[PDB]
Subunit: 203 residues, 3 copies
């Protein structure tokens, strides 16, 4: 009877389900917070996998200040059992002595450290101190990494980075809402999500 409603329901479902298709895009954003109240975002869209290393100079604010921390926003059909973040030293090392450092540290940020912001999204806050660097790994949920599919995955995976400067958190927040990505505001509230709702937050 109410096919107008049914169609809108299917559209909502479609939006929530499209990211699970094999060549769907994923979106990871690293929001850097500065004492000034300003933010800088490193926004990555990618279809298969993302490996990020933000060096200490990239993390600096225009004024030259280092960030208090980052909000790392994971969005899409990401394998949550392998999604991870760690704050390394100025050299990108998780042990001061490189001879005993590894690809990832024994206390890498993962598991339930990533907060649920919807079925499509996780977010985590990571405090930083001076000269810290940031590493992020996100991979598509399995396999495109097996045997013959690995070839297409390698050549198909074009990571598209953007760096965005925000004057205030309000700008970050509205950016996140309109980009449909998880964000955690300064009070710790989840104020943006990838999940589409047919009536918004009506309940």
């Amino acid at each position: 009877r109410d096919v107008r409603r049914e169609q809108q329901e299917i559209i909502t479902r479609q939006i929530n389900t499209a990211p699970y298709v094999q060549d769907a895009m994923m979106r990871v954003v690293v929001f850097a917070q500065y004492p000034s109240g300003r933010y800088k975002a490193f926004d990555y869209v990618f279809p298969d996998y993302l490996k990020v290393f933000l060096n200490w100079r990239e993390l600096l604010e225009g004024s030259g200040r280092y960030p208090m921390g980052v909000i790392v926003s994971f969005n899409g059909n990401i394998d949550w059992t392998r999604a991870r973040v760690e704050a390394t030293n100025m050299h990108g090392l998780n042990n001061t002595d490189w001879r005993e450092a590894r690809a990832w540290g024994p206390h890498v940020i993962c598991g339930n450290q990533l907060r649920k912001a919807g079925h499509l999204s996780r977010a985590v806050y990571v405090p930083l101190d001076e000269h810290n660097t940031v590493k992020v790994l996100a991979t598509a949920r399995q396999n495109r990494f097996n045997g013959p599919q690995l070839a297409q995955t390698l050549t198909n995976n074009i990571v598209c980075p953007n760096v965005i400067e925000f004057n205030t958190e309000s700008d970050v927040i509205d950016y996140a809402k309109m980009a449909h990505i998880a964000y955690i505001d300064q009070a710790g509230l989840i104020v943006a999500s990838s999940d589409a709702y047919i009536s918004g937050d009506s309940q």
Copy 2:
């Protein structure tokens, strides 16, 4: 009898055939055209595959102007059935809503949209508007992407980018001729090619 001629013929053939050897170099160039009449070239040489994303700030002219469009020049033993280009939005997305965007769009630039500039070369003009971004994919013609060869291909593939600024199209044109790469001049003529001719354009 005329072995001097035969040898020159073999040299011509060798030049035209060398790019088809498995570890041969390929060359893709993105020529950005600005209203000023100036051009900027993103010149990539690579042995196996190339994935390019040019962000909106990279595409800007020194003055700060955005390009009218790009000429994408494909050269070498490229798989023409998979070679492609697309103009994405400022975020590198082919759908404004990332949740319904994909690795490549439903109308990606490919097939006979790429103009033949010789057996070794294709070229295509792509008009751009403000904040557009550019994505290019080029892969070596099959397999180096199969099973055990994929390992060497991954580690062997060092993409060597150069960014070159030109004052006038004449500079672009002579650059393309001497670099043996396809280029399409402002009148739409193919004025450069990778194909070697023993007597030049003598017919």
Copy 3:
């Protein structure tokens, strides 16, 4: 009896052996030497493989001078049979004519051209002239590149680059000693190494 000594011996061994674990970090550094007496270092840490192309503008000193040459320092569980360096032209080509250029040149720098600086380290000096570019390849000693392991290797390999400016060679030298990496001083002496010694250079 002397378990204090034994433990220190095991610690020394552990430091020397840790880099051979499958997810251990490797470290490659390209030290650029300028006529000014200043140096610039491109310092890479990575777990699986490293592909480097330093373009001519990256190689320039702040003043705008080109380097006299580079010291390439290889450290870790590197496959010394495949480790290599070459100085290409401004375009990253090992043949002026790209149609006859290849992934690596017929006289690529490898084998015993790399000087032994310990069981963990090799180093080589490479003179450069204006507009030369530099290519480096280093891979973990086998296999993580075979079949099903290639997937993890691809996603696990986050290369962490740092660019460091030094005022004098003395600064470079002490940097190399404290970073436990091979370096060859201006007299040609090996003055730094990754190898840990329980009593230092006491013999």
